[PDB]
Design a protein around this nucleic acid. Structure first.
Lengths: 122, 115, 229, 56, 119
RNA sequence: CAAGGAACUCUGCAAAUUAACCCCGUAAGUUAGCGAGAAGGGGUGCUUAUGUAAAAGUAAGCCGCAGUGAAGAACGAGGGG
RNA sequence: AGCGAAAUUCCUAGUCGGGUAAAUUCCGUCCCGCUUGAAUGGUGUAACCAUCUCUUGACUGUCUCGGCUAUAGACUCGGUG
RNA sequence: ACCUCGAUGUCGACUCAUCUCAUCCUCGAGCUGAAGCAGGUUCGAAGGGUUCGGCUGUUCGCCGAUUAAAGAGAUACGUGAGUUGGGUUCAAACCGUCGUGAGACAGGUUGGUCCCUAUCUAUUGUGCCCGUAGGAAGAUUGAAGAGUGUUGCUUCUAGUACGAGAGGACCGAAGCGAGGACACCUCUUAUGCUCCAGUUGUAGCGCCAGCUGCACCGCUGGGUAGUAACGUGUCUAUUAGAUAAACGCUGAAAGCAUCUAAGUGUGAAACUAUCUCAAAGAUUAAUCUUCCCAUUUCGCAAGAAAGUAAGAGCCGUCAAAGACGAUGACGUUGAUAGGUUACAGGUGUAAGCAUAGUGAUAUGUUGAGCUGAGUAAUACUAAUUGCUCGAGGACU
C-alpha cells in the first residue's frame, strides 16, 4: 500500500533515511506499489556527508512493505517497515551494504546484483 | 439428493499429511520449505515463533515470526501445503490461540512453556 | 462448433494445492448425469440443440402436464429443463457422464445466475468514486452525480436513454470464460473448477466448452503430499 | 421541486386505482360456528379445531 | 439525527426477551406480538434444555437469564422449574412450546399471537 | 476498519492526535512578572511488609495483551503581518 | 527623518538568496517610492489574541479507497393526517 | 438592443459525462533534402485512452516529475428543483489615492446564511389488469438492439539486415504486465452489537465466589455464516465479410499508357458478425411440445343450470430470494423454517474440587468450557380437520 509521496525508509549503506515516491511506473493511476517495483524518488531526509544529497531525483526499488504481499505459492511475507534500495539507472544498486534479508518474490524480475549481496534470500 | 457439505472435506482426502504435528500460537518452532532453486530443491529453515493458527480443515494456516538482521519478519505458511517440514523445540504456554500483541510486544523473546 | 454442456450446483469454494508451488482456489460443483428431454435438429427445428432436463425430483411431485409428458416420453421427473446449442452428439433420454464431455485439465467457460443484491446503489452498481468529505461539503455524498447535460429547448432538454442508474443488482445469467478444469469425481459425480463461481451456494451452474480456446488443452498436475514420518 | 399544475378527477382516480384492496382469506371452523381466516385461532377457545384457550 | 427517541435496539429486544421468558415461566401463556415470540422461542427452548440437568454450574448459567416478579422470586421460579417442569419435557426432542396466531391488536392492528406450553 | 499519512483542499475546516495525579527536565526573549503543563520522558494495578493521625513513598512476590484498566480531562514548535 | 512590492506597488507572478523535487502564497533583501511617510502620526516594540497566514514533529477514512454494526426515518401494516 | 427583465442564478472547485473531428497515441497507407534508428510530411481514420504534485479564489496560466500521448471544441463561459461558496457583487474595517463633504476606486486587504414533503414527462429497476383468440405449463427462433471493442515493457529471432564507424530495426513468437469491468469471501484484512475470551468500578442478586443494569457493545483480542476490497481468477486476443484512404492486374476512349469505364483483387484500432445481456406488447402479437375435458340438457346464436379430472390464487413455513410487490421451495405422505441431538469450526483449560503460597498467584482436574447465522439425522413444534377462480373450444 505504497503510493506517491509515501515517506519511505532506505535500508542500504547510503547517507539518506527518508525519501518520497514521485511516480510509480506502469499504467496511469498505478497508485499502488509492492515488492520489486521500480519507482522515482525525491530525497527528503539525507545526511550532508552521504553519497547523495536531499532533493535529488533518483531511482529506487522497494524491498520491504509493512503490509507485506502475497507470494504466488500462498506464503504471505509481511514486514514491519517500508524500505527501499537505490539503483544507478540499471539492475545494479548504489548502496554497498544490505541491512536485512531480501525475499524471492522479486528475484524473477532480475536485479540479481541486489540479491547477491542480500543478507538472506527468502 | 441433498447436499451435505461434508463432501467438501471428502474431496480433500487426496492432499493431506498424516504427520499432523499439533502446535499453538506462541510455539518456538522451525518450518523448513523445500523450494526448488532452478534445480536443487533446497531446504530453507524458517525458525521463529507461532502467532496465529486458525482455519477450516485444509484452510488451516499459521504465521511464523522471527528477527533477522535486527528486522522482525513474519510470514504465513499453509499446513497442508507440501515441502513444509515442521519441528517444535519448546511447547509454550499461551492463554489464547492468537497473539496480536506479539507483533509489537517483541520484548522477552523467550515465552513461558506449558507443563 | 460442438460445445458441450453440463450442469451442477456450487456446493463449496476452497483452495487446492497444485504443483510448481502454486495455490489454486477451487469452487466445488456437485453434478449429476442429466437426461435428454429434447433434440432440436438443423432440419426439424431449423437449428440443432439439446433441451437437457436436470435437477431430478421424486415421481410423487411434478407438473402434471409436464409429468404426463414425461411418462408419455417414458422419461424421469426432473425439475429444470434448459437448452444448449451445438450439443447434438447423442440421443433422447440418455444419462451423460462429464468424462465424455471434457478433460480433467482443459479450459472451459461457465454460465451462472448472479447472487441477488437487491436494491443496490449506483456507487456500487457502477463502481464510481466519491470525492472529498472535508471542508463541510454538505450532507449528500452518495448520488448519481450531475444528471444535467443540456437545458432549454435547444441543446438536450431531457435525460437521455441509456443512463447508468441504480436498481436491482444480481440475478443475471452471465458467463465467464477461461476457468481451468482441475478435478473430477466419478464416484459422486462432482467437479473441482478454478476461479470464483458467480452466485451463492446451491444455485444452478452450467459449464460449456471454451469458446475461444477449445483446442488449447493443458493438464494441471496435483501437488502430491511429501508426507513421510 | 413542487407540483406545477393541478390534476384532473379522472386522472387522480386512475392513479388511486392501485389503492384498491384485494379479497381477504376465509376458512371454516366446524365445532364453533364461525368463518375464521386461515392460520388463525377460533374465538370459541380453540385454534382450527384444537382447543387451546378460553372461549373468548 | 439529533435528539429524538432512543430506539428499540437489539439490547432492548433481548432484555424484553428475558422479561417475557420469565413471565411465561411464571404463568405458562403469553399473548404479544408474533415477531417477538418467533425470536424468543429459540432462547426459551435453550433454557428448557439447560433446565433438565440441574447442576450447580448450569444453575449459575441460568442465573443470568431470570428476573424478579411478584408471583415468585428468581429463586422460587428456578426451584419450581427445576422441580416439576424439568422432567415434564424430558421425553420430547424440542417443540415444547407452540405459538398460535391471534387476531390483530385494536391499536396498530399488530398481528397478535400466544405462546403456550403443555405436555 | 489492513497500510500510507494533508499527498484531497482557498487553506490540517472538520476529525484525529494531547489530557487527570506523582517524579525528572525545560530554553530563547524577557519590561522579572512571565514564558511553563514550555520544549520533552518515566510510573499510576494486585498481595504482603516498611510505613503515618491519615497517607504519600519504598522493598519482596503476582501476572494480564493492555493496571486515572470504564468515565471526563491542553496537541505542540517555529516565522511573518 | 524614518520606512520602503507594505493591509499601500498598476506594471508584478519585480529581482535576488532561503523556502519548495517542483511555491502568481511565504521569509529577509535590493530603494526612481504609479498614489510611502512622521499625533487625519512614524519605527523598534516584551507578553497576549475563539486574530490572519506559512512551515514543522505527532496525528488521523480529509484523502489515498471505500465498506461494514445498531438504530430514527427512508419501505410495509393499522390509526390520524 | 431581441421572445425573457410579475426572476433564464452565475466564476470556480467535486461528481456525471456525452458527442464530433480541424487525430494526440494506439490502426493503416503514401512522399521525402526517408543509409538505419529517430523522423517530418498528407489523408482515411472517432473504438478506447490520454497523469500526478507546488502556486495562484484564479478556469486559465507557470514549474517539476512521468507515460505512447498528457489533443481541441460544444452541451445556458453544461452540470445547486446533484455539494460548497474560495474568489466574486450587502453593509462592517483599514491601507494608498481621489472628492473638502456624504463617499468612490475596472485597487489590495479580514470575515461576511445557498429554500424545498417529486405533480407530470423523460429516465434506471420491479409489479398490477388485459392482450398474445378454448384454458393451463414449459422450450424456443429471433424482431429489435445494448455492453464490449484499453494497452505498455522485457526476451528471442539479432546487434541481424541496414549501416563502414558509432549506431541500429522491420516481420513474427514467448513471457511479464499495469488499468478498468465481471465473479467469489477459500489465501491477507476489517466488520460481524442476543458469538467467545481477558478485564474496571459502581448498584444489587442477604453475604464470599460467580453474575447481571450502566459506562460508545464499558474497555481490550479476536471471531461462526455473511458482508464488502485492500484478498484471488478471467477478460482486452484471434478471425470472416463489406471495406475507407491506399496499393493492384487486364483494359479502352486516348492503337502508347491507364486500379475503372465492364471484369478481376488486396487492404483500417472504424462498420456487419463471431465474446456477453436480453427478449414475440416483435400488436411484426410468431413457432414447437405437453396437459385438461367435451357430465342429458337453454336463452338475441348455446351452456340459463353441475363452472376441471389441469393448474393457479387466498393463508402459513421460509431462502440462494427479498423496500413492499414480486421470485423459488415446502405445505402433514412436510426436513421448508425453528427446536432436540451430534458434528464441523471459532473463542480459548469453564465453574467447582484438590495441592502449593499468609494473599495475589502456580498445577492437576481440563484443550476443558461456551459458541446468533456453518453441517447432518430427527415431525418435537409451526405450516390445517381449510376457501376462491378455475372445462364444453366464440369464427375462416
Amino acid at each position: 500500500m505504497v503510493s506517491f509521496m509515501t515517506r519511505l525508509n532506505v535500508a542500504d549503506n547510503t547517507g539518506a533515511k527518508q525519501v518520497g515516491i514521485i511516480k510509480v511506473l506502469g499504467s496511469t493511476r498505478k497508485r499502488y506499489a509492492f515488492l520489486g517495483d521500480v519507482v522515482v524518488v525525491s530525497v527528503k531526509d539525507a545526511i550532508p556527508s552521504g553519497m547523495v544529497k536531499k532533493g535529488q531525483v533518483l531511482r529506487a526499488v522497494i524491498v520491504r512493505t509493512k503490509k507485506g504481499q502475497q507470494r504466488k505459492d500462498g506464503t504471505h511475507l509481511k514486514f514491519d517497515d517500508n524500505a527501499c534500495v537505490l539503483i544507478k539507472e540499471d539492475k545494479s544498486p548504489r548502496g554497498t551494504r544490505i541491512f536485512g534479508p531480501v525475499a524471492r518474490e522479486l528475484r524473477e524480475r532480475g536485479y540479481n546484483k541486489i540479491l547477491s549481496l542480500a543478507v538472506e534470500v527468502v | 439428493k441433498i447436499n451435505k457439505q461434508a463432501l467438501i472435506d471428502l474431496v480433500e482426502q487426496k492432499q493431506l499429511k498424516a504427520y499432523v504435528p499439533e502446535f499453538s500460537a506462541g510455539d518456538e518452532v522451525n518450518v523448513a520449505i523445500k523450494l526448488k532453486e532452478k534445480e536443487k530443491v533446497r531446504i530453507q529453515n524458517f525458525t521463529g515463533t507461532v502467532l496465529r493458527r486458525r482455519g477450516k480443515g485444509i484452510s488451516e494456516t499459521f504465521i511464523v515470526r522471527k528477527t533477522t538482521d535486527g528486522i522482525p519478519i513474519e510470514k504465513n505458511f499453509q499446513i497442508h501445503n507440501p515441502n513444509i517440514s515442521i519441528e517444535l523445540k519448546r511447547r509454550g504456554k499461551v492463554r489464547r490461540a492468537y497473539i496480536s500483541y506479539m507483533r509489537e510486544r517483541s520484548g522477552k523473546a523467550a515465552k513461558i512453556k506449558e507443563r | 462448433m460442438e460445445i458441450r454442456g453440463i450442469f451442477g450446483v456450487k456446493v463449496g469454494m476452497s483452495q487446492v494445492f497444485t504443483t510448481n508451488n502454486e495455490r489454486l482456489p477451487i469452487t466445488v460443483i456437485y453434478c449429476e448425469p442429466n437426461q435428454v428431454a429434447g433434440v432440436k435438429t438443423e432440419a426439424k427445428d431449423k437449428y440443432s440443440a439439446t433441451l437437457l432436463s436436470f435437477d431430478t425430483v421424486e415421481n410423487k411431485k411434478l407438473n402434471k402436464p409436464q409429468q404426463g409428458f414425461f411418462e408419455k416420453n417414458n422419461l424421469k421427473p426432473t425439475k429444470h429443463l434448459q437448452e444448449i446449442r451445438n450439443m447434438t452428439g447423442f440421443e433422447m433420454g440418455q444419462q451423460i457422464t462429464p468424462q465424455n464431455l471434457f478433460q480433467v485439465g482443459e479450459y472451459v467457460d461457465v454460465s451462472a445466475i448472479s447472487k441477488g443484491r437487491g436494491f443496490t446503489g449506483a456507487i456500487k452498481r457502477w463502481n464510481f468514486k466519491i470525492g472529498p468529505l472535508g471542508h463541510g461539503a454538505g450532507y449528500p455524498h452518495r448520488f448519481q452525480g450531475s444528471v444535467q447535460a443540456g437545458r432549454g429547448g435547444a441543446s438536450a432538454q431531457r435525460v437521455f436513454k441509456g443512463k447508468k442508474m441504480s436498481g436491482h443488482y444480481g440475478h443475471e445469467k452471465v458467463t465467464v470464460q477461461n476457468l481451468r478444469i482441475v478435478g473430477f469425481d466419478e464416484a459422486n459425480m462432482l467437479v473441482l473448477v478454478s476461479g470464483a463461481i458467480a452466485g451463492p451456494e446451491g444455485g444452478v451452474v452450467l459449464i460449456r466448452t471454451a469458446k475461444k480456446k477449445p483446442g488449447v488443452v493443458k493438464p494441471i498436475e496435483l501437488a502430491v503430499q511429501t508426507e513421510k514420518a | 421541486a413542487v407540483q406545477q399544475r393541478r390534476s384532473s378527477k379522472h386522472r387522480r382516480d386512475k392513479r388511486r386505482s392501485h389503492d384498491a384492496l384485494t379479497a381477504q382469506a376465509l376458512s371454516v371452523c366446524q365445532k364453533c360456528g364461525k368463518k375464521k381466516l386461515f392460520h388463525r385461532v377460533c374465538s370459541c377457545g380453540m385454534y382450527g379445531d384444537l382447543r387451546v384457550k378460553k372461549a373468548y | 439525527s439529533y435528539i429524538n427517541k432512543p430506539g428499540k435496539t437489539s439490547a432492548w429486544r433481548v432484555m424484553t426477551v428475558r422479561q417475557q421468558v420469565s413471565a411465561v415461566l411464571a404463568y405458562g401463556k403469553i399473548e404479544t406480538t408474533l415477531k417477538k415470540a418467533k425470536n424468543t422461542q429459540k432462547r426459551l427452548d435453550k433454557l428448557i434444555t439447560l433446565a433438565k440437568v440441574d447442576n450447580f454450574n448450569n444453575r449459575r448459567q441460568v442465573k443470568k437469564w431470570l428476573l424478579n416478579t411478584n408471583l415468585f422470586d428468581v429463586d422460587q421460579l428456578m426451584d419450581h422449574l427445576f422441580s416439576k417442569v424439568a422432567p415434564k419435557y424430558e421425553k420430547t426432542p424440542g417443540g415444547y412450546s407452540r405459538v398460535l396466531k391471534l387476531g390483530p391488536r385494536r391499536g396498530d392492528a399488530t398481528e397478535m399471537a400466544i405462546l403456550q406450553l403443555t405436555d
